From Swiss-Prot:
Catalysed reactions listed for this entry: Thiol-dependent hydrolysis of ester, thioester, amide, peptide and isopeptide bonds formed by the C-terminal Gly of ubiquitin (a 76-residue protein attached to proteins as an intracellular targeting signal)
Modes of activity regulation: Inhibited in vitro by GRL-0617.
Stretches assigned to the Macro domain: 1-165
Location within or outside the cell: Host endoplasmic reticulum membrane
Protein name: Papain-like protease nsp3
Residues of the whole record sequence present: 1027 to 1191 of 7096
Taxonomy of the source species: Viruses, Riboviria, Orthornavirae, Pisuviricota, Pisoniviricetes
Subunit structure: May form homohexamers. Interacts with N protein.
Gene name of this polypeptide: rep
Task performed by this protein: Responsible for the cleavages located at the N-terminus of the replicase polyprotein. Participates together with nsp4 in the assembly of virally-induced cytoplasmic double-membrane vesicles necessary for viral replication. Antagonizes innate immune induction of type I interferon by blocking the phosphorylation, dimerization and subsequent nuclear translocation of host IRF3. Also prevents host NF-kappa-B signaling. In addition, PL-PRO possesses a deubiquitinating/deISGylating activity and processes both 'Lys-48'- and 'Lys-63'-linked polyubiquitin chains from cellular substrates.
């Protein structure tokens, strides 16, 4: 199973790791993608997960959007995990760099509660522009299921652990 994680709470764990490398190693039931409403996996975690699937995630996602239309900010959809996981839970956290309501981050994390265990990034962190310390706090206060957080940046990982209340 998951190794080398620091336990933050009863159900939240954290590790300084590349979520792609973590997913290829563990092959979890669910890997969370930091998705946008259009499932356009261009950069950040989404671009990296999609590149690891040889673009199969994007092809599947475009068919999903053609059929269903875009997701809501704070919403999610379950698609294939391809070579990374059994499933990919595409979750849309608010993108602060697009003026999206940061209060939608709790709604985004509520999607994790439909899955008993997940490998995930911090929602709305990175290129989504939110404060990762705030994202971790919303995660621990919202998610009740077992969440294994992969934080790519070592310096951010150390700051998150050292400042965790
Ligand atoms: C494995 C486990 O007990 N998970 C905790 C929660 C649960 C409770 C009972 C049945 C299934 C899920 C997750 C959903 O929110 C409520 C607690």
């Amino acid at each position: 199973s998951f190794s080398g994680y620091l336990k933050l709470t009863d159900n939240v764990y954290i590790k300084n790791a590349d979520i792609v490398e973590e997913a290829k190693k563990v092959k979890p039931t669910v890997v969370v993608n930091a998705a946008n409403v259009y499932l356009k996996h261009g950069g950040g975690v989404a671009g990296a997960l999609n590149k690891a699937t040889n673009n199969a995630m994007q092809v599947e996602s475009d068919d999903y959007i053609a059929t269903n239309g875009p997701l809501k900010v704070g919403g999610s959809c379950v698609l294939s995990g391809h070579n990374l996981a059994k499933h990919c839970l595409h979750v849309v956290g608010p993108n602060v760099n697009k003026g999206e309501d940061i209060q939608l981050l709790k709604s985004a994390y509520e999607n994790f509660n439909q899955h008993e265990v997940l490998l995930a990034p911090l929602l709305s962190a990175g290129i989504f522009g939110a404060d990762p310390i705030h994202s971790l706090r919303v995660c621990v206060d919202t998610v009740r299921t077992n969440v294994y957080l992969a934080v790519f940046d070592k310096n951010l990982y150390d700051k998150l652990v050292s400042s965790f209340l």
